[PDB]
Scaffold this active site. Structure first.
Site, PDB file in Angstrom:
ATOM      1  N   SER A  58      36.857  39.843  48.920  1.00 59.64           N
ATOM      2  CA  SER A  58      35.704  39.389  49.703  1.00 59.64           C
ATOM      3  C   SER A  58      35.746  39.759  51.181  1.00 59.64           C
ATOM      4  O   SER A  58      34.743  39.534  51.873  1.00 59.64           O
ATOM      5  CB  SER A  58      35.551  37.881  49.574  1.00 59.64           C
ATOM      6  OG  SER A  58      35.143  37.572  48.259  1.00 59.64           O
ATOM      7  N   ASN A 339      47.461  37.728  45.154  1.00 60.59           N
ATOM      8  CA  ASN A 339      46.513  36.715  45.610  1.00 60.59           C
ATOM      9  C   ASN A 339      47.303  35.430  45.805  1.00 60.59           C
ATOM     10  O   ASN A 339      47.623  34.734  44.843  1.00 60.59           O
ATOM     11  CB  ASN A 339      45.384  36.552  44.596  1.00 60.59           C
ATOM     12  CG  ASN A 339      44.392  35.447  44.973  1.00 60.59           C
ATOM     13  OD1 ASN A 339      44.368  34.971  46.105  1.00 60.59           O
ATOM     14  ND2 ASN A 339      43.560  35.047  44.010  1.00 60.59           N
TER      15      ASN A 339
END
Length: 357
Positions: A58, A339
């Site tokens: 993102s 992540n």
């Protein structure tokens, strides 16, 4: 010095989060400083280098917001334009009153975080938006969503006649000399593409509708350092509409809590309270936490130099963070092929940039 605070912060972070590979750039008084750790490919012991490509997730939304800003500056679109102006097949009644501003800033009224994984064709995508029923009136609640800003990016490029990737390449990447930044990694560059790691398994981002527009950029630590420099000091860019678009992406369109919503970028007043940004990045367990009431800023406040400007991003196997303070000419990029939790990224970025004031 920069080297001591970077090592003192990132080395424990890498150990605590078991991060396989990482690249950091610190922007300090108009010059970048690069650091790399670990592996782009664990099995092959291929090290992270300054040319390793990471999935931005993102953080890609900041590129989409700037591309949209450039289209505004070109006179091709206005955020006050209805979404239906660029997608007339969006005939469903709930789209009356929804603008590009709403799509760009997640305020359309509850568009979902993810496009459904069953959306495959263009007819699938039209049906998804035609059948969506908003939970709120437009311009009242912020609900962070790929289906919102992803559609903004796709529609923002329609007057240009160019595909989203052609527009992004010719209007953003190439003017800023981001020569190793890609939506689709070309075959000759795949040797530089790090593997992401999710539960010890090597992974790359999966295909999805609006992936390019919402989370699909891959970049090096050097190009991202150039990206931060360009967004920190847009007046140094010789392309007028791109300079203006960069500025428009840091305009403040909505206020909610301690933060202001730009185009892709999010902003807080500087000096910033570290708990405000560390806590604001935490996992939203409750449904109510996902919706935030917004206060309209009309006209939008032009980019405030005394801001903490930042954005988190993740894919299945990558975690990234970008933050900068234009007033202090200070910024950081953190790219990792795992992540790992957003609060850990923000705290590390805070400790580094706070030590460099």
């Amino acid at each position: 010095q920069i080297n001591d605070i970077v090592h003192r912060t990132i080395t424990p972070l890498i150990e605590q989060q078991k991060i396989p590979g990482m690249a950091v750039a610190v922007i300090y008084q108009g010059k970048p400083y690069y650091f790399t750790w670990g592996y782009a490919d664990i099995a092959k012991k291929q090290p992270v280098t300054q040319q390793t490509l990471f999935e931005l997730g993102s953080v890609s939304k900041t590129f989409t917001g700037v591309l949209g800003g450039d289209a505004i500056a070109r006179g091709e679109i206005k955020l006050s334009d209805p979404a239906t102006k660029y997608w007339p097949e969006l005939t469903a009644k709930q789209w009356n009153g929804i603008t590009l501003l709403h799509l760009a800033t997640y305020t359309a009224g509850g568009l979902p975080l993810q496009v459904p994984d069953e959306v495959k064709s263009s007819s699938d995508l039209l049906r998804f938006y035609q059948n969506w029923q908003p939970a709120w009136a437009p311009g009242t609640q912020r609900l962070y969503a790929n289906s919102s800003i992803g559609l903004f990016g796709a529609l923002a490029v329609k007057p240009s006649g160019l595909s989203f990737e052609q527009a992004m390449q010719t209007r953003v990447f190439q003017p800023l000399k981001l020569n190793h930044t890609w939506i689709n990694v070309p075959p000759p560059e795949e040797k530089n593409y790090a593997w992401g790691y999710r539960e010890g398994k090597a992974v790359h981002v999966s295909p999805g509708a609006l992936d390019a527009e919402a989370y699909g950029v891959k970049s090096t630590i050097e190009d991202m350092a150039r990206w931060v420099r360009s967004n920190m000091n847009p007046r140094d860019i010789n392309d007028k509409t791109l300079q203006q678009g960069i500025q428009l992406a840091q305009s403040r369109y909505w206020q909610t809590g301690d933060m202001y919503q730009g185009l892709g970028w999010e902003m807080l007043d500087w000096p910033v309270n570290p708990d405000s940004i560390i806590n604001g990045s935490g996992n939203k367990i409750a449904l109510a936490a996902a919706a935030h009431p917004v206060k309209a800023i009309t006209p939008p406040t032009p980019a405030v130099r005394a801001s903490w400007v930042h954005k988190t991003g993740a894919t299945g196997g990558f975690g990234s963070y970008v933050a900068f303070i234009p007033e202090k000419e200070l910024g950081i990029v953190m790219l990792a092929n795992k992540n790992y939790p957003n609060p850990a990224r923000v705290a590390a970025a805070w400790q580094i940039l706070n030590a460099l004031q």
